[PDB]
Design a protein around this ligand. Structure first.
Ligand SMILES: Cc1cc2nc3c(=O)[nH]c(=O)nc-3n(C[C@H](O)[C@H](O)[C@H](O)COP(=O)(O)OP(=O)(O)OC[C@H]3O[C@@H](n4c[nH+]c5c(N)ncnc54)[C@H](O)[C@@H]3O)c2cc1C
Length: 498
């Protein structure tokens, strides 16, 4: 079958693109390899919590895993599971594990909701060919409104047990001269206040986030994708994974698409063709499709920048042991509200999330997800033998990121007479987790693999829309940037190309 436009994936880039295509009257099919998350499970909820992981937690794994930072307290709840089309996929490369969402809404299903604009001067540094005025005057505000970004009530924040953990780190940071900032979110903070009051079913306040939130979080299925479906011009097919892309002889695109069940069994393989093809399969998924197409000869005119320029947004996790007089609380909202902004665009920059921990008892640990400025980049290299695009990143490539995170938290420790935890990541003494990524960026970089609007070099009517466009780093949690860039891009593409 033929459809005018196909969008691969249903994350941020995809969702923006499909909404605007549908509003423009372009009949659009979205193909999502994961599930539509709307069926109550065996506990009556759609998603499993972090204290009760089951097969819904994991994309085709045989055992649940603890949230990073929390193995010491949450390994006790791990269990063997059947490989299943669950919501969170730990993708293992040789020296890097990248975590991604799988389902209608992509990473919006599993992420912490943190909705942050990058510093304009940093945006201008990383993407000098893009008009920063339209981004800050038009596309960032548009994204914030459509995403349903909202702001925590500061009096509630100050008073509630559920944010003690955040207030402790604010106080400790302050002794080192370092400031915090409130971080806007797509989790409804009014709902969260009502959870604390016992008035509505808990989600953030019942140790849910990374395997989905049963309530409160305005993931993309509720925002952009609901609106896209509302146009009457967009449909979504789930458990459909695009495997290959080719150009037809008349300049359209044809896809091989596998349909599976939730156990992973192959039900059918279909050919889908289109006029306009939009990739929204993520940093990993879009890049793999294009590297595969180049190196197996189905899109032979793709350039050498396809696959290049990947970075983990400088992601590093670390933790501090608090004084006994500074407990962080047994009750910690799963949605962060505060960060430490020590980002000045130099190589010592750090923007850190003050991360909650789900243990549910007092541990005195403060956890942080640092975002750093590390120029190292990796490349996805096609392995024809296994048919996989393998990220060649080495752990030593994160040394600059570790060094920046360590310098910042050493200041905090010095000012407070505290030490790191060394036991949260494995039994070897390791204070800094340096081989994970929640924020994969790059692989199909804007202006390198594509033009300045994500048009893939070498091809007409072929677009990349997602985190693969970003040059490895944005200095903040990335989805607002992905969303705003996608607003900019699809608007231009519809005007000039469609
Ligand atoms: C634990 C965790 C916490 C995070 N916290 C935050 C946060 O608070 N704030 C923030 O700004 N960011 C956060 N992020 C990152 C954010 O979720 C991520 O940058 C965006 O989701 C990336 O959006 P994309 O559109 O690039 O991409 P993404 O959302 O990953 O969507 C790609 C979609 O394409 C699907 N797909 C992939 N390949 C195929 C294929 N071949 N055929 C069909 N479908 C396919 C895939 O299943 C998925 O649904 C977090 C992520 C994680 C994992």
């Amino acid at each position: 079958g033929y459809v005018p436009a196909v969008v691969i994936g249903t994350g941020y880039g995809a969702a923006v693109s499909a909404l605007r295509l549908g509003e423009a009257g372009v009949q659009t099919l979205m193909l999502e390899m994961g599930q539509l998350w709307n069926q109550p499970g065996p506990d009556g909820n759609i998603f499993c919590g972090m204290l009760n992981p089951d097969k819904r937690s994991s994309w085709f794994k045989n055992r649940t895993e603890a949230p990073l930072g929390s193995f010491l307290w949450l390994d006790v709840v791990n269990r063997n599971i059947d490989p299943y089309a669950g919501v969170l996929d730990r993708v293992n490369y040789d020296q890097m594990s990248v975590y991604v969402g799988r389902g209608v809404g992509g990473g919006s299903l599993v992420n912490g909701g943190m909705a942050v604009e990058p510093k304009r001067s940093y945006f201008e540094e990383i993407l000098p060919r893009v008009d920063s005025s339209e981004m800050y005057d038009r596309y960032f505000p548009r994204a914030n409104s459509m995403l349903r970004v909202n702001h925590i009530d500061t009096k509630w924040f100050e008073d509630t047990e559920w944010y003690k953990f955040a207030r402790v780190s604010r106080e400790q940071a302050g002794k080192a001269g370092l400031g915090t900032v409130f971080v806007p979110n797509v989790y409804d903070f009014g709902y969260m206040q009502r959870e604390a009051a016992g008035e509505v079913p808990k989600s953030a306040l019942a140790t849910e986030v990374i395997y989905g939130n049963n309530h409160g979080k305005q993931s993309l299925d509720k925002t952009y994708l609901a609106a896209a479906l509302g146009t009457g011009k967009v449909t979504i097919q789930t458990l459909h994974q695009v495997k290959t892309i080719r150009q037809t002889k008349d300049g359209g695109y044809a896809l091989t698409v596998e349909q599976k069940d939730t156990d992973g069994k192959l039900l059918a393989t279909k050919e889908i063709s289109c006029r306009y093809l939009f990739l929204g399969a993520g940093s990993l998924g879009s890049t793999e499709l294009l590297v595969r197409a180049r190196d197996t000869g189905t899109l032979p005119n793709l350039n050498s920048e396809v696959g290049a320029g990947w970075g983990p947004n400088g992601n590093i996790m670390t933790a501090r042991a608090n004084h006994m007089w500074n407990p962080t609380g047994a009750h910690q909202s799963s949605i962060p509200a505060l960060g430490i902004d020590a980002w000045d665009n130099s190589d010592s920059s750090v923007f850190a999330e003050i991360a909650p921990m789900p243990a549910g008892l007092e541990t005195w640990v403060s956890l942080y997800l640092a975002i750093t400025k590390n120029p190292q980049r990796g490349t996805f290299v096609y392995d024809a033998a296994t048919d996989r695009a393998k990220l060649n990143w080495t752990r030593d490539q994160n040394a600059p990121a570790v060094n920046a995170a360590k310098a910042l938290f050493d200041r905090i420790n010095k000012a407070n007479g505290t030490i790191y935890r060394y036991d949260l990541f494995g039994t070897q003494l390791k204070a800094f987790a340096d081989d994970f990524c929640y924020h994969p960026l790059g692989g199909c970089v804007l202006g390198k693999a594509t033009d300045d609007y994500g048009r893939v070099a070498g091809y007409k009517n072929l677009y990349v829309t997602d985190g693969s466009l970003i040059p490895g780093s944005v200095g903040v949690n990335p989805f607002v940037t992905i969303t705003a860039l996608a607003e900019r891009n699809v608007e231009r593409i519809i005007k000039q190309d469609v």
